[PDB]
Amino acid sequence: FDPAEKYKMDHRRRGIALIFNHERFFWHLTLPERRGTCADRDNLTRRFSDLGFEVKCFNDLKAEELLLKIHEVSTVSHADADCFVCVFLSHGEGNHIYAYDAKIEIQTLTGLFKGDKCHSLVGKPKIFIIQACYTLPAGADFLMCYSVAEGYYSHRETVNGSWYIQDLCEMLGKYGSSLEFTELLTLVNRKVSQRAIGKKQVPCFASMLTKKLHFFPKS
Amino acid sequence: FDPAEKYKMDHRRRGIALIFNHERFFWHLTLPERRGTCADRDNLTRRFSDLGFEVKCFNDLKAEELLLKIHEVSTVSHADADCFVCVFLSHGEGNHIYAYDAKIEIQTLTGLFKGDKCHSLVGKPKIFIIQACRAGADFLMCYSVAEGYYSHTVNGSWYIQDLCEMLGKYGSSLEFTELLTLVNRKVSQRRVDFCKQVPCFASMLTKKLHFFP
Amino acid sequence: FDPAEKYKMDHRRRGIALIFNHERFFWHLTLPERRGTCADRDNLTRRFSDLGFEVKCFNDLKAEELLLKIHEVSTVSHADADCFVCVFLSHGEGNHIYAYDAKIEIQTLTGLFKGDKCHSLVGKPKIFIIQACVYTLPAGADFLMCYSVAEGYYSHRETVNGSWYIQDLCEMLGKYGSSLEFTELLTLVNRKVSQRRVGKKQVPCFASMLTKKLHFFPKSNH
Amino acid sequence: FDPAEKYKMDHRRRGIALIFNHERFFWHLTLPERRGTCADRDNLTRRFSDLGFEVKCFNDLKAEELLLKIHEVSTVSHADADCFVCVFLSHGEGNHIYAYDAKIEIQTLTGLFKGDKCHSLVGKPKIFIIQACYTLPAGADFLMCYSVAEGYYSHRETVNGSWYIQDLCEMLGKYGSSLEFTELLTLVNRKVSQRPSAIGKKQVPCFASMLTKKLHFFPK
Numbered sequence: 001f002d003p004a005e006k007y008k009m010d011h012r013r014r015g016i017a018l019i020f021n022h023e024r025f026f027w028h029l030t031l032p033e034r035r036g037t038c039a040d041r042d043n044l045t046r047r048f049s050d051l052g053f054e055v056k057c058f059n060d061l062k063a064e065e066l067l068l069k070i071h072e073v074s075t076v077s078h079a080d081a082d083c084f085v086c087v088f089l090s091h092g093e094g095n096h097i098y099a100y101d102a103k104i105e106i107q108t109l110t111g112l113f114k115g116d117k118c119h120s121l122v123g124k125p126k127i128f129i130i131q132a133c134y135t136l137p138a139g140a141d142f143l144m145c146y147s148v149a150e151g152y153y154s155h156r157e158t159v160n161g162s163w164y165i166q167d168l169c170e171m172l173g174k175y176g177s178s179l180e181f182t183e184l185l186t187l188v189n190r191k192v193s194q195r196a197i198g199k200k201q202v203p204c205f206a207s208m209l210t211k212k213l214h215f216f217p218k219s
Numbered sequence: 220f221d222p223a224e225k226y227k228m229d230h231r232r233r234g235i236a237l238i239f240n241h242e243r244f245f246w247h248l249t250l251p252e253r254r255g256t257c258a259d260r261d262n263l264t265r266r267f268s269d270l271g272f273e274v275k276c277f278n279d280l281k282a283e284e285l286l287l288k289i290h291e292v293s294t295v296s297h298a299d300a301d302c303f304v305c306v307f308l309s310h311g312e313g314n315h316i317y318a319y320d321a322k323i324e325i326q327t328l329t330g331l332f333k334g335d336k337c338h339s340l341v342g343k344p345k346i347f348i349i350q351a352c353r354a355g356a357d358f359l360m361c362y363s364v365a366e367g368y369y370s371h372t373v374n375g376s377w378y379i380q381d382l383c384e385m386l387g388k389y390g391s392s393l394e395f396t397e398l399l400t401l402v403n404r405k406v407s408q409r410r411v412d413f414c415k416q417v418p419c420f421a422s423m424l425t426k427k428l429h430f431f432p
Numbered sequence: 433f434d435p436a437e438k439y440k441m442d443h444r445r446r447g448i449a450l451i452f453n454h455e456r457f458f459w460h461l462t463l464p465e466r467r468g469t470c471a472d473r474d475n476l477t478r479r480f481s482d483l484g485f486e487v488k489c490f491n492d493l494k495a496e497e498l499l500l501k502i503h504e505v506s507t508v509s510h511a512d513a514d515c516f517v518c519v520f521l522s523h524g525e526g527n528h529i530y531a532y533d534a535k536i537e538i539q540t541l542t543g544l545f546k547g548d549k550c551h552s553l554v555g556k557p558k559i560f561i562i563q564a565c566v567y568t569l570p571a572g573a574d575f576l577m578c579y580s581v582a583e584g585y586y587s588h589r590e591t592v593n594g595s596w597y598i599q600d601l602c603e604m605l606g607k608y609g610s611s612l613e614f615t616e617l618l619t620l621v622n623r624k625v626s627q628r629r630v631g632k633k634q635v636p637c638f639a640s641m642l643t644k645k646l647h648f649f650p651k652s653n654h
Numbered sequence: 655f656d657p658a659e660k661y662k663m664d665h666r667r668r669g670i671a672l673i674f675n676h677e678r679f680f681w682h683l684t685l686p687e688r689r690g691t692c693a694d695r696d697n698l699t700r701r702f703s704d705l706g707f708e709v710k711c712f713n714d715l716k717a718e719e720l721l722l723k724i725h726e727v728s729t730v731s732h733a734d735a736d737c738f739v740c741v742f743l744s745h746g747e748g749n750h751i752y753a754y755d756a757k758i759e760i761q762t763l764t765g766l767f768k769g770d771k772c773h774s775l776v777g778k779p780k781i782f783i784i785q786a787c788y789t790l791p792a793g794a795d796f797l798m799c800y801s802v803a804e805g806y807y808s809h810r811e812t813v814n815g816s817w818y819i820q821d822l823c824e825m826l827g828k829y830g831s832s833l834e835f836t837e838l839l840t841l842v843n844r845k846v847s848q849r850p851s852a853i854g855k856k857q858v859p860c861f862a863s864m865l866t867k868k869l870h871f872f873p874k
Contacts, residue, residue: 138366140417150354177832190425202356206421210404217828223658392610571804573858583792623866635794639862643844
């Protein structure tokens with residue numbers, strides 16, 4: 001009935017910001033790759049803490065640990081939380097095995113939080129920010145954010161980080177609390193797209209959200 | 220730079236609203252199908268004219284005509300226009316050939332308006348509204364149904380209906396993606412009631428989108 | 433609590449838009465006055481109908497009729513209405529008596545719709561748009577006071593096409609009435625009028641005693 | 655014209671937040687008055703620093719110092735600043751002389767920053783927050799914010815501050831950087847308005863906008 005309806009963000013906790021590092025099948029690890037990834041994690045941890053999130057970081061190197069942690073996030077109660085965030089960071093060179101593993105990891109992650117698998121988040125926004133190395137993942141109140149659209153260029157990681165994660169992090173710093181999230185993501189669209197003169201890196205987001213999304217500060 | 224930047228909507232023409240009716244490989248045509256499809260076309264034509272669009276309707280039955288028309292829409296100049304819209308309507312029963320042809324038709328339609336193929340629309344929004352059956356900067360992809368959700372009459376289809384409703388009520392008021400989000404909630408609860416079943420849009424837009432008079 | 437809370441605009445009726453024409457102590461009525469006022473009235477009636485309002489127009493000439501009508505708008509029930517709007521239009525030259533009568537007329541109008549006198553509107557916005565020719569009127573909760581001109585600033589002449597303020601307001605209402613939050617819309621009117629040219633700036637003003645956001649999204653037939 | 659145009663907030667400095675304490679001509683100074691006033695000043699100094707302002711505090715007791723400082727803030731250049739803020743705090747009870755001096759002080763304060771008198775601020779917002787103890791200032795890009803509308807009650811000062819300044823400060827803390835300023839002030843309207851003897855009354859604050867653009871205090 002209401003053209004201004006918002007997801008209720010007045011729960012005790014904001015929620016979890018899961019930052020997932022895809023590192024297992026990569027081989028040539030130039031300092032630009034390594035330092036730039038640290039830059040993207042560190043930057044995202046800052047921005048997401050400031051919006052109230054519990055940031056949790058792990059990589060897929062520790063085969064034994066990803067089991068435990070991944071299991072924890074899924075089963076734990078989110079009843080007292082507003083939303084869930086998951087950032088999937090990856091690298092550029094990407095061999096085919098690395099690239100293939102990526103898709104399977106993202107498919108599992110997303111699949112964990114479908115309402116059928118996770119009652120505590122039902123009706124609450126699930127936001128996935130995916131640094132591709134552009135897909136088809138599904139669910140109501142899901143927000144799929146992609147570093148790059150289907151068949152567009154993706155600039156090499158730098159020691160400073162990646163265009164997408166940088167620019168997102170920037171917008172989050174400046175407009176995190178102010179703007180409706182998809183508006184903010186649209187700003188990230190223009191910013192990155194204006195960063196063989198291939199024409200552009202054009203990021204994307206796919207919304208299955210049913211209400212407005214605001215990260216006004218909590219008490 | 221400016222968090223409130225908008226696509227410039229002050230050109231001479233608003234733009235073309237292309238309404239594409241997919242019916243070539245369908246054989247079981249109950250009145251609900253045929254009358255509901257007319258309902259979706261007629262309804263969409265009213266709503267979009269009210270937003271200033273030139274509405275053009277054709278189907279893929281006349282294999283001769285589609286060639287000519289499809290060719291026109293691509294080649295013509297859009298320099299004096301704000302944006303481009305394209306609605307792709309398709310029936311629910313859907314055999315496999317019909318389903319398959321759909322994907323191909325959509326693939327081509329969208330491909331026509333990539334900046335690489337269409338300079339007159341560069342920096343302008345290209346909006347595709349796709350009634351599913353079973354890329355580009357400034358592209359907006361709206362789908363009746365997300366990946367692997369259910370998607371269902373004589374008066375029309377939930378998605379096109381609700382869309383049309385929102386367009387009538389908030390077309391001029393709301394930012395487009397916010398208007399689409401209303402359609403998200405409307406449909407996803409229409410299904411819950413008559414019976415999750417959630418529409419979807421994918422934005423590669425860089426600015427805000429308003430259909431002020 | 434909720435930084436985005438809105439006055440509930442989902443009542444059966446939008447409400448009344450009262451357009452009040454102050455004409456009684458004016459003497460020289462050049463055609464620019466007479467035609468420009470009609471233009472402001474007609475323009476405002478169009479714009480406010482489009483936003484759902486029952487527009488009602490009267491002037492203070494018919495001293496018998498103003499008694500009835502004024503009482504009607506006060507006493508009638510507004511329980512099934514979103515808000516109330518009142519525009520007070522006046523002329524520029526203004527003799528002292530005309531100017532003085534203006535102040536008293538505004539005092540009374542505004543006074544009628546304080547929650548103390550008008551239960552049906554308690555909690556609902558009361559928007560007065562005043563073409564000045566008092567500014568202490570500003571008393572009420574959920575009151576919005578909009579003035580053609582701030583204290584001690586130039587006021588546009590009236591022209592045959594209407595007045596800068598009412599014109600510009602009506603323009604914004606047409607383009608942004610259903611889209612923007614009202615005070616956001618008024619701020620646009622602030623910039624538009626203040627950049628009207630034809631040395632003196634005119635700077636309009638509004639005083640908000642509103643507690644929520646104000647939107648005039650189109651209503652449901654249902 | 656752009657329905658979303660904003661005052662350019664990208665200058666080197668945010669600007670000055672002037673907090674002015676009206677003290678002279680006040681006689682009975684109960685601890686609630688004195689402690690509550692410090693509370694309002696300290697609270698506003700925190701909140702305004704957090705939005706980037708140079709906070710400057712003085713009162714009208716030091717008859718020599720007000721001359722100097724008042725002159726300073728007027729004549730100094732603001733070309734490299736976004737806006738100007740000025741809070742005028744007073745005490746509730748108020749003898750008539752105190753009340754009268756208030757009006758004159760506010761009239762002079764506001765008068766200094768009219769574009770006629772102060773070129774460096776022309777086209778920049780001038781925001782006056784006035785705790786009342788008339789309502790006749792003016793100017794383009796001026797924002798006048800009042801603790802209390804004409805002829806409404808104002809709840810007494812307390813040891814923890816005043817309803818208006820408290821609530822304002824709360825919203826500034828929470829929404830200072832997020833919300834458009836008048837949107838934020840409307841939240842103050844509702845908070846205070848919704849707020850042990852002789853009272854069934856409500857306090858309704860007010861603001862008068864002569865602003866031409868949107869006002870946002872995004873972090874610098």
